[PDB]
Amino acid sequence: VKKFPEGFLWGVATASYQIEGSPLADGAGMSIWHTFSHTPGNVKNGDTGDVACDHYNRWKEDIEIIEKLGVKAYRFSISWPRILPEGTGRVNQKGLDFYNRIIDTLLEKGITPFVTIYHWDLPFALQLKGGWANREIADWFAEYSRVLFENFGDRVKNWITLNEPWVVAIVGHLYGVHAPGMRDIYVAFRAVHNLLRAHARAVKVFRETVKDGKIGIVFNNGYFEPASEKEEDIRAVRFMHQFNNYPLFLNPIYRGDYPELVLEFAREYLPENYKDDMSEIQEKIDFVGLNYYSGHLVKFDPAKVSFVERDLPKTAMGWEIVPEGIYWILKKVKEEYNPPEVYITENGAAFDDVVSEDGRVHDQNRIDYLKAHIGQAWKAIQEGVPLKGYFVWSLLDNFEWAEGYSKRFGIVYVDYSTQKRIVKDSGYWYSNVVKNNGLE
Ligand SMILES: OC[C@@H]1[C@@H](O)[C@H](O)[C@@H](O)c2[nH]cc[n+]21
């Protein structure tokens, strides 16, 4: 028996562009994921978010699935361009109505809404004006956030400004693998910095608008272990943590500067007077959300870092399964920054799910993955990490960004030819976990 604290939030998580479809319904503006995925060569099999899980029409059934499973919290995101089609100025009432109906239904059913304000679908109109590269995004984001607060802050009390700003900046603007598909290191670090200033401006508006809520920010994290005992391999791991994990953003937020190994690699790429923005960036936040999935063996390599293949079980993504990582990153966040609250805002796995003659989905692979990680998060709670909740990625199989529909992360199976949902063995298993408030 590994029982969790009283009132611990068991959740599932999604994102707007990944599940909704109908990206241009009811007056919505185009997002950068619409235009990116409609550009040939950008996404596996030419997949797009045009239909996805059709959650835009099937939202009530999906929520009834959450209810039926006894899951207590739902993390979902809001499509910025459904709300403000040109990014700023005009507010689309039908976009608001979409999420209002979802919010009210959740509350009526006793499910707690966790709203991610930004999960990667920037209005195309703002990308034309530079997107995250443009300092003015701090204002655009603040105005968008304000609209959300004033419309939903009466019911939604748990808010996340940004999902994984490292991904948004680096993967979108350095690697060119995600929208807007750019490859410029100077742009990428100007996006890092602007994402911090936009987050902080949104927290500032939140304090003025929603006197009773809590607001945080979510980061992607990996468990980096060194390839050897050498100083250089250990330092490589020190860099990877500071750059890829929560320190890139939490050091500015809590300590007022970037981490030192980030400045050694990247100072030339940041704005010259970037320090002028640091005091505003230190705006107080209520919680840290950490996403965690995999570990990496790492060595210095004359980036100056490469990864080392390890045997280890991998998921269908080719990601090594390292459950002790989730315990480590939870310990390390307390040790380094001691935020008053942490949530695991995403944890999950992609496996090659098949519907058996059954037709059940016997994803014992995913049960083992989840169980293992839930166990390590228990451990962290026993050693005093203020972990208040845990969210499975994902409720549904969905559009997995540049992988398209070929990667299935759901605890609910989606048959794309019909839109039939089939609860996986992992979903039933997780329901039992929530009911008992822990493992057995
Ligand atoms: O790759 C599975 C998922 C994506 O679908 C989510 O949008 C994203 O927030 C995330 N971070 C780490 C892994 N994932």
Side-chain angles (χ1 to χ4, degrees), residues 1-210 212-230 232-267 269-298 300-303 305-356 358-440:
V1 60
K2 300 187 189 205
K3 208 99 136 87
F4 278 65
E6 230 264 12
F8 186 84
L9 276 180
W10 299 101
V12 292
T14 60
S16 48
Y17 191 78
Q18 301 184 264
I19 70 175
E20 282 171 11
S22 299
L24 318 174
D26 302 322
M30 292 196 295
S31 75
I32 63 177
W33 264 94
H34 183 79
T35 60
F36 191 73
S37 79
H38 285 265
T39 301
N42 282 347
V43 183
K44 232 107 176 275
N45 262 14
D47 288 346
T48 78
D50 286 7
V51 180
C53 304
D54 184 34
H55 179 88
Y56 191 73
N57 296 293
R58 310 178 182 260
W59 62 270
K60 196 196 183 204
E61 48 203 275
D62 298 335
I63 290 178
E64 292 166 347
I65 294 171
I66 296 165
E67 181 180 43
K68 184 134 172 55
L69 249 28
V71 172
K72 297 193 191 180
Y74 178 45
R75 175 179 175 238
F76 62 99
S77 81
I78 294 194
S79 171
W80 192 339
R82 302 195 191 276
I83 311 305
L84 291 111
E86 335 290 323
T88 62
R90 182 176 54 101
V91 162
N92 174 24
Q93 188 55 51
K94 285 182 212 201
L96 255 25
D97 290 342
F98 182 64
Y99 298 106
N100 268 326
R101 283 189 313 268
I102 282 163
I103 288 157
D104 288 339
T105 304
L106 261 5
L107 267 5
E108 272 152 27
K109 300 179 183 275
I111 303 147
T112 301
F114 267 66
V115 171
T116 310
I117 295 165
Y118 186 77
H119 201 129
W120 307 2
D121 47 354
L122 187 71
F124 189 69
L126 295 182
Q127 185 55 234
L128 298 179
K129 289 160 152 210
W132 292 106
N134 189 334
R135 274 187 75 82
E136 295 176 48
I137 198 142
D139 301 323
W140 308 333
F141 192 66
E143 159 189 350
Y144 166 44
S145 290
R146 187 177 252 109
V147 162
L148 296 191
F149 301 150
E150 276 155 354
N151 278 273
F152 310 134
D154 60 306
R155 284 151 297 146
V156 178
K157 304 294 178 185
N158 297 274
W159 290 88
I160 293 148
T161 55
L162 306 173
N163 184 69
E164 303 184 347
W166 182 90
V167 181
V168 167
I170 301 313
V171 183
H173 307 76
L174 182 44
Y175 296 167
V177 160
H178 280 184
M182 198 168 326
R183 301 201 184 184
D184 181 316
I185 199 150
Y186 288 82
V187 172
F189 280 96
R190 281 167 171 74
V192 165
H193 193 69
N194 285 331
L195 278 158
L196 278 170
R197 307 167 45 253
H199 154 82
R201 286 277 275 99
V203 179
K204 202 159 182 273
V205 178
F206 183 75
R207 306 309 181 195
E208 302 164 2
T209 169
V210 193
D212 42 3
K214 290 177 187 204
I215 189 149
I217 177 164
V218 161
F219 312 105
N220 59 108
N221 311 266
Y223 183 40
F224 306 108
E225 306 182 76
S228 83
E229 281 192 23
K230 314 196 192 73
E232 54 181 23
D233 287 7
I234 280 269
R235 147 165 277 245
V237 159
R238 208 165 109 243
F239 170 76
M240 289 302 284
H241 177 69
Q242 284 189 352
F243 176 50
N244 281 252
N245 297 339
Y246 64 80
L248 175 61
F249 305 91
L250 284 197
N251 217 83
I253 287 163
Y254 281 106
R255 301 196 201 158
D257 196 8
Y258 289 104
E260 89 172 84
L261 302 195
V262 171
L263 296 169
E264 268 150 31
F265 169 63
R267 164 76 188 99
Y269 310 138
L270 288 161
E272 175 183 38
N273 299 133
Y274 81 79
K275 223 114 158 216
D276 292 354
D277 308 300
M278 282 290 156
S279 111
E280 304 98 290
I281 284 172
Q282 293 199 260
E283 189 68 36
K284 187 213 193 273
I285 64 172
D286 306 314
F287 70 88
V288 174
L290 301 179
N291 302 341
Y292 176 87
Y293 287 78
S294 76
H296 301 263
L297 199 65
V298 158
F300 172 84
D301 173 324
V305 176
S306 72
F307 300 114
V308 179
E309 214 102 318
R310 288 189 290 213
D311 224 31
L312 283 310
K314 285 155 184 188
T315 69
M317 305 290 304
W319 294 348
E320 288 158 9
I321 305 180
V322 185
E324 62 261 32
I326 205 166
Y327 161 86
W328 185 87
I329 196 72
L330 283 166
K331 284 313 288 284
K332 196 91 179 148
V333 79
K334 175 168 166 72
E335 156 189 327
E336 286 173 327
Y337 302 105
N338 195 29
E341 298 193 340
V342 185
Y343 289 83
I344 298 292
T345 41
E346 289 181 30
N347 178 248
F351 290 108
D352 301 309
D353 304 305
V354 283
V355 184
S356 55
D358 265 1
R360 289 172 181 262
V361 186
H362 295 302
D363 58 341
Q364 183 66 36
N365 273 178
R366 187 179 283 101
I367 297 174
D368 294 349
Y369 179 103
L370 260 13
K371 178 167 205 171
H373 288 84
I374 296 175
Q376 297 289 135
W378 184 82
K379 191 172 165 183
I381 291 183
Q382 309 314 124
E383 312 183 358
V385 180
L387 179 63
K388 312 282 170 193
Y390 168 100
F391 289 80
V392 175
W393 182 272
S394 180
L395 176 65
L396 306 156
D397 291 336
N398 62 50
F399 174 86
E400 175 60 28
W401 307 114
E403 297 289 322
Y405 296 101
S406 73
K407 302 302 194 272
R408 300 187 174 265
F409 278 84
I411 59 172
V412 176
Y413 185 96
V414 181
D415 181 327
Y416 290 119
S417 68
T418 51
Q419 294 297 339
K420 203 191 193 148
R421 280 77 163 139
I422 293 161
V423 185
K424 315 189 193 181
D425 286 6
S426 61
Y428 288 129
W429 176 88
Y430 186 60
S431 187
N432 189 226
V433 180
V434 180
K435 181 181 166 130
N436 305 329
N437 198 45
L439 302 181
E440 275 179 6

